[PDB]
Amino acid sequence: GAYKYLEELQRKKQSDVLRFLQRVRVWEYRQKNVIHRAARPTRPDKARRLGYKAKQGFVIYRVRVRRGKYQRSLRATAEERVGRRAANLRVLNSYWVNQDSTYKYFEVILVDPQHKAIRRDARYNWICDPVHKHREARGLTATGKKSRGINKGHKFNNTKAGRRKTWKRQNTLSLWRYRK
């Protein structure tokens, strides 16, 4: 397949060819709007390994944000922007495309949970449960989880299960009927 050839290529981000292509694509998108739809994705393999499958309901939007202290990411900022735009849609994940000196350009894999192909095909029926609404704004996609500080171990003690939960857990006095 083309999976690995594409992938190993796109890692080589400072080859002349991809930096050329990046220059063209930035000029293209920069004349375009901030938020817009792409019908088809730029890094299809990357998107596929982040959970796209090309069928009716999976959507792309391509998006521009500013750079230049903001403990969240630009990535997640973009995702809030599109979640507020297309609120029916549900954000699965996102990926870099390109950047500039001034901006960073991103892309996002989305779902329309009303669409019946999605409601069936139970690799993706999990999402039409109401819980995974507006994930990006609760930080439940992968960069949300990074910025929450959610991975494992004694390195990440102060945020492992939610910073605020464990803060309330350990800054509270527990008192029994029978004081120990």
Partner 1 sequence: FRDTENLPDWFLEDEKEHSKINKPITKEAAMAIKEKIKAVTLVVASGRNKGLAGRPKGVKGKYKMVDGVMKNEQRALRRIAKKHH
Partner 2 sequence: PILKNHFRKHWQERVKVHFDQAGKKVSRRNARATRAAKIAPRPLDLLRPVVRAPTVKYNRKVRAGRGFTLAEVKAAGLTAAYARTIGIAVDHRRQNRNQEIFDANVQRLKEYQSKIIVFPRNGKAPEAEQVLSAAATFPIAQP
Partner 3 sequence: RNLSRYVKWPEYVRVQRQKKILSIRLKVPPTIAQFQYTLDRNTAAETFKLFNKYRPETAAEKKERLTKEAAAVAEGKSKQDASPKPYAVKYGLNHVVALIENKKAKLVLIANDVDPIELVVFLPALCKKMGVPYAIVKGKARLGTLVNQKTSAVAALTEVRAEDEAALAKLVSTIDANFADKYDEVKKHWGG
Partner RNA sequence: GUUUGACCUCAAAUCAGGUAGGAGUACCCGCUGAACUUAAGCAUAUCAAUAAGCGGAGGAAAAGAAACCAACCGGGAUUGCCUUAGUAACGGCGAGUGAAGCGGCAAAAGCUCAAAUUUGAAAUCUGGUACCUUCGGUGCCCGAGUUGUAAUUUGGAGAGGG
Partner RNA sequence: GUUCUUUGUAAAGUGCCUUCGAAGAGUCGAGUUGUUUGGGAAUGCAGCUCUAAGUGGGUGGUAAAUUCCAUCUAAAGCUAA
What does 85 interact with, of partner 1, partner 3, RNA, none (CB < 5 to 8 A by kind)?
A: none
Instruction: State yes or no: residue 9 binds RNA (CB under 7 A).
Output: no
- Minimum Å gap between C-beta 103 and partner 1 is 7
Closer to partner 2 at the Cβ: 31 or 171? 171
Q: Pick from 17, 174, 177, 178: which binds RNA (CB under 7 A)?
A: 174
Kindly give, in sequence order, each residue whose CB lies less than 8 Å from that of residue 83, ignoring residues fewer than 6 positions away. 89, 91, 134, 135, 136, 137
Kindly give, in sequence order, each residue whose CB lies less than 8 Å from that of residue 142, ignoring residues fewer than 6 positions away. 93
What does 30 interact with, of partner 1, partner 3, RNA, none (CB < 5 to 8 A by kind)?
A: partner 1
- Minimum Å gap between C-beta 169 and partner 2 is 10
114-173: contacts with RNA (CB under 7 A): 114-117, 120-121, 123, 126, 129-134, 137-171
* Region class of 64: left (phi > 0), else alpha (psi between -120 and 50), else beta: beta
Closest-CA residue to 75 (of 103, 41, 111): 103
5-44: contacts with partner 3 (CB under 8 A): 5-6, 9-10, 16-18, 20-21, 24, 27-28, 31-32, 40-44
3-state secondary structure of 22: helix
- Minimum Å gap between C-beta 163 and partner 3 is 40
Exposure letters 25-56 (e unless 16+ CB within 10 A, then b): bbeebeeeeebeeeeebbbebbbeebebeeee
**Pair type for strands 36-38 and 90-99:** unpaired
Binding site for partner 3 (CB under 8 A): 1-3, 5-6, 9-10, 16-18, 20-21, 24, 27-28, 31-32, 40-44
